[PDB]
Amino acid sequence: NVSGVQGFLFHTDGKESYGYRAFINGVEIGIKDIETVQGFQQIIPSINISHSDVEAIRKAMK
Amino acid sequence: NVSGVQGFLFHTDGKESYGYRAFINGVEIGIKDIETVQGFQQIIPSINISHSDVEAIRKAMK
Amino acid sequence: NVSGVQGFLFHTDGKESYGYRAFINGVEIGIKDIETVQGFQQIIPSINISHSDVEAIRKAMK
Amino acid sequence: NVSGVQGFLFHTDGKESYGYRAFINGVEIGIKDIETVQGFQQIIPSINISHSDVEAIRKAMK
Amino acid sequence: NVSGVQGFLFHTDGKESYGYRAFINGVEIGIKDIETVQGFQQIIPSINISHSDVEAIRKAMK
Amino acid sequence: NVSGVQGFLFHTDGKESYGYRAFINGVEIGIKDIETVQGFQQIIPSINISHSDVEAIRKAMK
Amino acid sequence: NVSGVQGFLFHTDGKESYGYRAFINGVEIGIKDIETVQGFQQIIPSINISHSDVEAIRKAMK
Amino acid sequence: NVSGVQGFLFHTDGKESYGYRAFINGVEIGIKDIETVQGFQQIIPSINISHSDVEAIRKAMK
């Protein structure tokens, strides 16, 4: 993996969107623009996580 | 493995269901929503574990 | 190996069964239910070890 | 990966261009010349990042 | 290598047989039963080592 | 990678040549002879970097 | 590499034989029996080194 | 790479030959015999390095 990035994008398609976020090298960030989502989709996976589950996933990606 | 996640989802098809859970980077979490299960099934395996065996698996998975 | 598990299931088909056990990440456990055996067979190998040899294998997986 | 380089080029196709930049082994640099962009595109990925998201990516990429 | 085992079985086909033995994660053990030999042949290689050479191999294999 | 070398050759085809250089295992060197360039091109990549960008790349390969 | 062995067998076909030797996990040993040579040829490479060069190779495999 | 060797042979086809040499696990050695060159060409690459560039390569290869 030449990119130097490990992690994933996450979002929900449920009624209660939080937009897109990512874990990148163990750091959680918000992604504001569509362009950046598409850019990182070239190099890391993009999965669905419901709003109610984000807190637990945060615990495990710490 | 670009995702930065090692682990697995687990559930039982037996009578005493505990829903879905996962080990994610050595942290055990409960998973509240179907969308999250399907999200993580994109990047980690999903296996069956009896209610009766979770305690021993917990011991191995720190 | 995305599962975060290294190890193997072991059992004997000799007259003197000890059921199924596993080394998971260097930790020995007993597996009580058939469902759990089949689940872990999705991600780690499953080999035969006679009852008389388990003590030596324990020494080496310590 | 024989190059000894992990990282990526990034740029925006939006209105507020910042040219090309890169993370190379966790160091952020600006890239002044087209020849260098084309050189590094031989060994590292090249993705789109909005001007608005660079600050968060910076935080993840140390 | 998902098994968490690195090592090999060894035996001699010469006149002074010592049965089967193995190095498993740098620990030397004797193997008492055919079932165990066949089990481990599923996950580690099995080679020939003369009785006369075991002492030197021991020195290398710590 | 059996060669024990990670890095790359770099040069510019711009008007202002600095000849060939390389980062080899994090050490920057000049390559004076054509024979050596061709030799290392057998084992590491060879990319273009403009003279104006070498200073930044040096910073990141430190 | 599941064998837990890194190294090589070496011998000379020059007039001045030293028999077979090996570096196994950074430890030099002599191999006395043909059976052991053939056994290790299943898992590590077997190359030619002249008697006059063994001293230098020893220096580098230390 | 099962050999436990990382490195390369080097020589020059220029007028000032130094014979064959190698870096083997970060140690530079001279190689006295053709048989050894052919042996190591089985496990490590063999490249051209001008007499004039050896000093710089030495600096990188520690």
UniProtKB/Swiss-Prot annotation, chains A, B, C, D, E, F, G, H:
Keyword Zinc: no
Xref: InterPro entries: Endolysin_PlyC, PlyC_sf
Keywords on record: Antimicrobial, Cytolysis, Host cell lysis by virus, Viral release from host cell
Domain of life: Viruses
Gene3D superfamilies found in the cross-reference section: 3.30.720.190
One GO term (biological process): killing of cells of another organism
UniProt GO MF annotations: identical protein binding
Effect annotated for changing residue 58 to K: 3790-fold decrease in enzymatic activity of PlyC holoenzyme
Record-marked site positions (Interaction with the host cell wall): 20-21, 28, 51, 58
Effect caused by changing residue 58 to E: Complete loss cell-wall binding and of enzymatic activity of PlyC holoenzyme
Self-association state and partner proteins as the record states: Homooctamer. Part of the PlyC holoenzyme, which is composed of 1 PLYCA and 8 PLYCB assembled into a ring structure.
Misc: Part of plyC operon, which contains plyCA, lil and plyCB genes.
Function: Component of the endolysin PlyC that degrades the host peptidoglycans and participates with the holin protein in the sequential events which lead to the programmed host cell lysis releasing the mature viral particles. Once the holin has permeabilized the host cell membrane, the endolysin can reach the periplasm and breaking down the peptidoglycan layer. The small subunit PlyCB is responsible for the specific binding of the endolysin to the host cell-wall, probably to the rhamnose of group A streptococcal carbohydrates.
Protein name: Endolysin PlyC, small cell-wall binding subunit
Lineage: Viruses, Duplodnaviria, Heunggongvirae, Uroviricota, Caudoviricetes
